[PDB]
Design a protein around this nucleic acid. Structure first.
Lengths: 83, 105, 93, 73, 97, 95, 103, 97, 78
DNA sequence: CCGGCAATCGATGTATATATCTGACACGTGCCTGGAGACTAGGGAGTAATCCCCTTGGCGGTTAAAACGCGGGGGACAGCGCGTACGTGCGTTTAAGCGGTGCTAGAGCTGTCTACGACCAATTGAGCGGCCTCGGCACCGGGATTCTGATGGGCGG
DNA sequence: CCGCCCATCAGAATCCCGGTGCCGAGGCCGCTCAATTGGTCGTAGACAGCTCTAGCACCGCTTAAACGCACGTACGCGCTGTCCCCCGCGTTTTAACCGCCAAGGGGATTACTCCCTAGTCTCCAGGCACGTGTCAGATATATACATCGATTGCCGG
């Protein structure tokens, strides 16, 4: 089933919590839309690489190993989910 | 003295490291002392990180080490921070740090 | 199928360093990933070093130069000392 | 809508076709404008070989797209 | 009526969320977003739970680091509020197109 | 005077195919040589890692295609994939 | 030769030999050198086309590293590909911030 | 006569953004390279091409750093670059901890 | 010898960088950052030279060191 | 007689101490697969000797860049005022999260047999090094065009 | 009546054109070594079949988180003034750059040997999967302490 509108599921309080962990005290009201755009771009890149890795192996299921390999390819190593 | 690790006096395996070197497509041949050198270096690095993480775990009145303690150990040492500069540790967190301007007067 | 890992050796090192603390399951995964990452980095640098000088073998000289290139300032000296001591002990016995 | 066909000689030609136009029609136009016979031409787009019975909209070929022409002798 | 002045609860939240380790985004919305994004490249795909977990961890780390750089850029201009131009400057200097 | 190999003649042939009346200097030739070598190393390393992940002992055209897709961005990947597929088809047909 | 069979300009045998003696994998298939040579030739042709246009713009008949730099930096895909690469004797793109210009 | 301040600066910006020459004298750079290298190992020799490559790399690095510094200076509503802008650019890039 | 990098040279570099006005304390910072960069690169190049048992530093060592740092350089035999 | 500064005091949030139980960590057993011991054959790497090329060091001159000083205009910084956007709190609404239930697509393993890649030998032509020659490009002198800032002028508060 | 905005002049600055020369790019020739062709052999991997697991869909209930609204305040932004510090220009100094000469150290090649590594076979024990007990830590509850913001008293103008 095709779904949309799902970028708005990243609510304003969640972005505020991320900013609080980042050390931010005051937030302008236009930060949330740009944050959503940045997150969308990042996810698009990583998911494209992971899907390429999955389809090379002739599988119909995306595994955590594909995500780890894609993240390493983009120069972002991740410890904990195998590898 | 039967195993190579016992001869070298290590805890990490020498035969397994040799096998990994010979099958990783690195070079045509592998010398005798290369697995010994590599195993010693890996054991040293593991010991350093584990000692720092254990001190961090004791600071929290805890017995077992969790990824938070590893993150605290790595981020507080300059050499380890330089080595693991582009590495994200799952369920780690961040170092507490607040800029001096934001504090009340 | 059997799956190999570095868990037992990491635990032995930990029991040698801190003889009272334990380790959880996620921290063990993190340590496994760390060991694998460092192994791959050093091995790749050594292979490139051997390729540069037109050699078909990997020796302890390549490993020494690789750890000098990869590891930062104060880590490299102690790592070199440990590797040299291990190789000397292996040769003597 | 217009597309561009590339040949092995580095020659890029422009074709005026429609999304509903079939590959056989595209081919017929290419012979009319270049003289190359039907049997010898093979079309490659996105790494796939096109089929004469299919249409351009089937392969999601949009405006200003590029396709590679292969001569088979 | 008891009431705190602006900026106090903000510092309290900064201290709270810099000491925990949990994820700061609800799981179901992120799963839905990931599936929708992946629908563009190939339909009828499946995901392991570990894949979505790894994606969430990477995304949260990336956003937190970006916000740290944004805070530094905002302070450089003699301000305490973060604004979109600070995000743009941090991204541009970092080399991200 | 040990023989030293390079990509100079092939680059010049391609240039004469593209711009029939245009030359090239020595420094530009060095830059082109470095570019070709660097791209070769990148693609070969990516393909080798791909083969290692799936527990294979052979590098095939599938590995090269996937490496090209992973490395080259945008329409560059599409056109390069098409060129490689056409070349492989022509090589297989001829004997 | 194999390049003649594939209709290429770049060498297939040399690419095959480099693949076999590069410590990449135990075995190398028949079509991998052909694919790799085709891709390399395509990239070379793209860069050379842009550089030749740049050279013609300056009323020059020979390509110099400045023309290669101008060709690479003015194209989005090539700029993304060669993002962390320095070209000797290349220079920079002319660019002045609008705030610094006189009123 | 006399040009108003800021004009000749723009002229030099236009002139130096079009050429491709090296902007540092060769003998001072050679001397600096030799005295730097004498710390890691004494009794050393250099090919001329090695010094040329070192100069090219260092000049490119400095030019990119100055571009980032100018961007940071503009962000703070200024036209003069200051050491704090260099520090901010280096910190955001990742070289400075 | 770090003072051999004169102020006009730094000004020329800034002009190529697109800078119009320069403060008086920028030259010291520029000298420091250049020294740090050179130290890193030369350390790596000398290590590469010593592995090969040579007493002369070549351009290949510089290219390899720069590639290791993440800055590929074209036009010197890479 | 109020204002700014400093000492109370109530509300609130966070850390601390005490059972309680539970899921995870640490330990015990069988076996089987990979590592160790012994021996042989061969080529990769160490060692010595030559040669000649490139790097280092010194000398003379010339001239272009650097250093130093001066005067001044424009930009950086501090202070003030305003107004609106953002933080804190409260009441209401919504969907995330948990707990089951079922089902099935697909990932993972196993046996087979076959086509594909490695290896070996003989042959020959493509590519590399060396030499020459000439045309694109660097250099110098002169004229044309273009901004740029001072000067004269005009205008409206 | 005078400060602010507008049109017009000379003067450096950059560029284009024409003649001259000169060095690097393009072409040609000889040889050698690496790619091509033919044939044989072994195993890597494609393909079929089966098993079971974990990913997807649906339903019901709680309740905590999200959402919408109101109020007030503190921070951002614009304006003004000053003061000093970078910029443009002229004079004097210095040392970079070019050309030339000379010496010798070390990089690159070649020949020879020997010893270190791969390959084979046999044997056995260390490590992994599985199973079980118990205790370190999360949970719920009660409690003490630190902190913040309104209230009020006191020295002072």
């Amino acid at each position: 089933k095709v779904l949309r509108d799902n970028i708005q599921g990243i609510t304003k309080p969640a972005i505020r919590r991320l900013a609080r962990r980042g050390g931010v005290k005051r937030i302008s009201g236009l930060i949330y839309e740009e944050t959503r755009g940045v997150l969308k771009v990042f996810l698009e890149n990583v998911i494209r690489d992971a899907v390429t890795y999955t389809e090379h192996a002739k599988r119909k299921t995306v595994t955590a190993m594909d995500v780890v390999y894609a993240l390493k390819r983009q120069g972002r190593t991740l410890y904990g989910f195998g590898g | 003295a039967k195993t190579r690790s016992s001869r070298a006096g290590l805890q990490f395996p020498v035969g397994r490291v040799h096998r990994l070197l010979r099958k990783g497509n690195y070079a045509e041949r592998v010398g005798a002392g290369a697995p010994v050198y590599l195993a010693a270096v890996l054991e040293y690095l593991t010991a350093e990180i584990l000692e720092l993480a254990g001190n961090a775990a004791r600071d929290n009145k805890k017995t077992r080490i969790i990824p938070r303690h590893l993150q605290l150990a790595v981020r507080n040492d300059e050499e380890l921070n330089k080595l693991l500069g582009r590495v994200t540790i799952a369920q780690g967190g961040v170092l507490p740090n607040i800029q001096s301007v934001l504090l009340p007067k | 199928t059997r799956k190999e890992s570095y868990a037992i050796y990491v635990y032995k090192v930990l029991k040698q360093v801190h003889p009272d603390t334990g380790i959880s399951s996620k921290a063990m995964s993190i340590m496994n990933s760390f060991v694998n990452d460092v192994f791959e980095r050093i091995a790749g640098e050594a292979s490139r070093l051997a390729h540069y000088n037109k050699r078909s073998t990997i020796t302890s000289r390549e490993i020494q130069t690789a750890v000098r290139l990869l590891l930062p300032g104060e880590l490299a000296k102690h790592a070199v000392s440990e590797g040299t001591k291990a190789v000397t002990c292996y040769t003597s016995a | 809508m217009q597309i561009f066909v590339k040949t092995l000689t580095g020659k890029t030609i422009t074709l005026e076709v429609e999304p509903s136009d079939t590959i056989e029609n595209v081919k017929a136009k290419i012979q009319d404008k270049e003289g190359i016979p039907p049997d010898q031409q093979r079309l490659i787009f996105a790494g796939k070989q096109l089929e004469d019975g299919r249409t351009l909209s089937d392969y999601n070929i949009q405006k200003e797209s590029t396709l590679h022409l292969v001569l088979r002798l | 009526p008891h009431r705190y002045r602006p900026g106090t609860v903000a510092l309290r939240e900064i201290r709270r969320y810099q000491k925990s380790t949990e994820l700061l985004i609800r799981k179901l919305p992120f799963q839905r977003l990931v599936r929708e994004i992946a629908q563009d490249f190939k339909t009828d795909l499946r995901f392991q739970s570990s894949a979505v977990m790894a994606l969430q961890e990477a995304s949260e780390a990336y956003l937190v680091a970006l916000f740290e750089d944004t805070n530094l850029a905002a302070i450089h201009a003699k301000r305490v509020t973060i604004m979109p131009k600070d995000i743009q400057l941090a991204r541009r200097i970092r080399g991200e197109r």
